[PDB]
Amino acid sequence: HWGYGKHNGPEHWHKDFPIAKGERQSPVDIDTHTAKYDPSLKPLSVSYDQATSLRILNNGHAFNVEFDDSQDKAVLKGGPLDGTYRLIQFHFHWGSLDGQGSEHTVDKKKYAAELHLVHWNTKYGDFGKAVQQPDGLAVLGIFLKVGSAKPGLQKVVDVLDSIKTKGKSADFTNFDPRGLLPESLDYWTYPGSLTTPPLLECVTWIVLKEPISVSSEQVLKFRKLNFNGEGEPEELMVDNWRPAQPLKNRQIKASFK
């Protein structure tokens, strides 16, 4: 099955998931000089005060921190969005080295990692229905650079030893995702896709201009995770990013000048 290795990586995905060569694939390179400022785009509303995290899971490609999405407890609204999008999970993509790891790029620059906060449009009732809709998901993407530690990440880093291998889960309650946000909510936005199979073209991407900083130690701990299950041959979970895809007939809009 699909992965990020020599024989099953992003260049192979199209064989099982032909939409990989579709018209609205993600990620993309964000050319800051060609993005259009759209003064009518509204400020994002991020309402995470009642968020209920439940669990953290190594799924063999990344780890997901999962939330109770059976009520409007953590929601994204405004910006380019119509309606209310509920937080279901977040996960990251990261590199084997600090010079790579992000999925989106900014003027071809790669960051060390990228955080994806995944939300689904409540008009569709559940996540599985939402992913079948062109406006089903809103993903808040946040770049990570290496520098000072991010204290709000540390609880995640701590628990990684409990979910080293594919299929392992751990209780992960009371995590506050507001500790993963930068100061500014200035963003770019464009229509795209999931960046892992099934690659569905259901995402309004909202990519923050300002990265967060994490420490070398924090990223190193991500790089100790394993793609494999316990008792299978060890392969470090690194470089679990899809490269930039053609923009095709899309314009990236900016909330800021």
Pairing of strands 253-254, 63-67: unpaired
What is the Cα–Cα distance from 146 to 67, expressed in whole angstroms? 27
CATH number of 1-257, picked from 3.60.15.10, 1.10.1240.10, 3.30.70.20, 3.10.200.10 = 3.10.200.10
Query: Do residues 19 and 202 touch, judged by C-beta distance below 8 A?
Result: no
Check the annotation: does 1 bind a ligand.
no
Query: Do residues 25 and 193 touch, judged by C-beta distance below 8 A?
Result: yes
Check the annotation: does 7 bind a ligand.
no
- What residues contact residue 150 under an 8 Å CB cut-off, 6+ apart? 144, 179, 180, 212, 213, 214, 215, 218
Check the annotation: does 91 bind a ligand.
yes
- Please indicate the experimental technique that yielded this structure: X-ray
Check the annotation: does 204 bind a ligand.
no
| Closest by Cα among 144, 110, 107, 117 to 47 | 117
- What residues contact residue 129 under an 8 Å CB cut-off, 6+ apart? 136
Q: Is 139 left (phi over 0), alpha (psi -120 to 50) or beta?
A: beta
- What residues contact residue 244 under an 8 Å CB cut-off, 6+ apart? 27, 28, 29, 103, 104, 105
Length of the chain: 257
Query: Do residues 81 and 94 touch, judged by C-beta distance below 8 A?
Result: no
Parse the chain into domains and list their residue ranges. Answer: 1-257
Give the residue numbers marked as catalytic: 61
Query: Do residues 104 and 92 touch, judged by C-beta distance below 8 A?
Result: no
What is the Cα–Cα distance from 75 to 45, expressed in whole angstroms? 8
